[PDB]
Design a protein around this ligand. Sequence first.
Ligand SMILES: [Zn+2]
Ligand SMILES: [Zn+2]
Lengths: 323, 338
Amino acid sequence: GTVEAHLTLGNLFRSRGEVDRAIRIHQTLMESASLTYEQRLLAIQQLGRDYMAAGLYDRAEDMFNQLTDETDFRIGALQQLLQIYQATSEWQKAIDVAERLVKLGKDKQRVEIAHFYCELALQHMASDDLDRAMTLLKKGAAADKNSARVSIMMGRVFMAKGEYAKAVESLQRVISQDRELVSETLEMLQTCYQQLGKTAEWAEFLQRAVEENTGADAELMLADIIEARDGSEAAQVYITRQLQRHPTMRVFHKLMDYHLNEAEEGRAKESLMVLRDMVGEKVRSKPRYRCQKCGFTAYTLYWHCPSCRAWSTIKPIRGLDGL
Amino acid sequence: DKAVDLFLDMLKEDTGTVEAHLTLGNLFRSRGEVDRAIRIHQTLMESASLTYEQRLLAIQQLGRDYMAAGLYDRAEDMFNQLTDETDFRIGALQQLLQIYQATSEWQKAIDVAERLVKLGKDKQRVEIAHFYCELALQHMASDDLDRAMTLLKKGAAADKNSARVSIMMGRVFMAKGEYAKAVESLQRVISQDRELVSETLEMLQTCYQQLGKTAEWAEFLQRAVEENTGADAELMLADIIEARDGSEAAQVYITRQLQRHPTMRVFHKLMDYHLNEAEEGRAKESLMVLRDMVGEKVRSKPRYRCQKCGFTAYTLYWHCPSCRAWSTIKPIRGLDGL
Ligand SMILES: [Zn+2]
Ligand SMILES: [Zn+2]
């Protein structure tokens, strides 16, 4: 009746962005004596959502904390608390709430739990545990065994410990977890294979990677192998063939290097070097990654999209301006 | 209906019945519930207790309601009631200006824009000229060239610096077969907008052909290259050099401009010469692969970009689809525009 109208009117002001008005309406309702207990819970819930929209997370937390012990509100209350603790980077608290949601039991929240443990592990990778970091990552793996991020971070910790064999095992898990993130592991894997004395196998790994269209990284990397091994002629032939098959400005830029280093010298090179330099500056200015959810582009890999707040949606950009 | 009345009731106890109706109508408009917004604001207008100032606010809100609904003529009837009120005049005129453009009522758009200019909105001079161009475009459909030209001249009087007016005058002069006059008009773009010179090159090429003044044409391209207007003039001038001074002399010019203003298009042109001479080997391999890739990159890259909002396109728009600004979309520079 009147109570639902009050609740709704408050909601309308919230979605309009007039959160102060929403707060006033819902708080006055929450504090009214005419309300039933159930109606009051509804008021507390909406007031909680008002505080969320306002960025008043301590206040929001107080509201939702009052609903976790209510069957009709428990699910939403934990869900909102989960959002709060992420927004405030209270990862341990986010885990605990996500745990309750999982034991209630929300399925997909295992994904976020893994990321939360990763966030915690980062705090111990800094200050260099490193045992504490690995412990957290293992808990992360337990939560989501299909998490590419966990695999990558374990690889980095293993490499820090000089455990290159174990690093390869973790890093190559990415192949079956998220193909689009394999390119993020190539630099680390290259170092690992060198430490393991398996440079030959690495060259084959890359050969198969290019065949699976891993992109410019795996191509340029294998080109440097062809060069040091079979000379600059064999490398230029390779890049030439690949450039036709997978046109990219990065491979383009490399092929110009081969020509520029072989053909000299004079006004022909002068203008050519100017162009190749232009390509280089352009490649350097372009974004490397892009959120597949909201199209937020970036320069470095974000696991948590600063825009849409989603997890593991930002992948390397493909195409001519990508890899 | 009953819900709205409930909403109005609880708002009234806090802010008064007038502000309650205004606010709630506004709230529903912003939600896309414009039918609801109109009925709320209409009900407010039925009140006998409205002060004159409050009635103006209600009129303003209904105008905005009708605009949101696309009931433009009803919106106009509202805003026209506000253009003599000091606190509402500028905003009302601007709303009307937006309406008339949305409805392609160019002459009414001109009339309100001209009043805004008088009231200090100098930026509307640019738009007035465009509106006259839109009107000119109608009398060219429709080979009514004399009226089209009359309209373009009114456009020039509003904005003597309008490049679009110069280009369209060029079109009309070319339609009349008066090619010298077309040249005089089109060449004003050199001073009116450096970045739109490239848009005149094809028309000027045609004019100079009809005039048989092939020497004055190369002279203009030199002016355009000197002003750095893009790769189009460089490529056109390159063809003139090749036919006049041979392929070698052209490759040297292009290499010069490529060292000076590097672009993919000019680079592609430079590659054509090498490929046109090179024989089988690593040349026909790497050079061909490179050339064809540049060709695809050029063939795919958009040519234009709005300098205001960043919207890109493959053809020139005078009116930006994204931000609705005029004269903001220009050719993209760098590789390979410059
Ligand atoms: Zn995103
Ligand atoms: Zn725009």
